[PDB]
Amino acid sequence: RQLRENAEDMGNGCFKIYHKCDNACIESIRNGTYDHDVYRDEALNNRFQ
């Protein structure tokens, strides 16, 4: 629900984020603060292209 569209569930119990994500980028997701819109445009591209 948090990651939203930015990533996909590989199935192996991991989410294959579709965009460059630095350590800070990761940390922002673990607390729950992370926002999808930020990387939305970026991720969306690597997915369907």
Q: Provide the binding-site residues for ligand NAG, judged by CB under 6 A.
A: 24, 27-28, 31, 33
17, 25, 29, 44: which one contacts a copy of itself (CB under 8 A)? 44
Of 9 and 27, which CB lies nearer to ligand NAG in the complex structure? 27
Of 12 and 31, which CB lies nearer to ligand NAG in the complex structure? 31
Q: What is the DSSP string of 4-46?
A: TTS--B-SSS-B---S---HHHHHHHHHS---HHHHHHHHHHH
Least distance to ligand NAG from the beta carbon of 49, Å?
28
Largest CA distance in the chain: 30
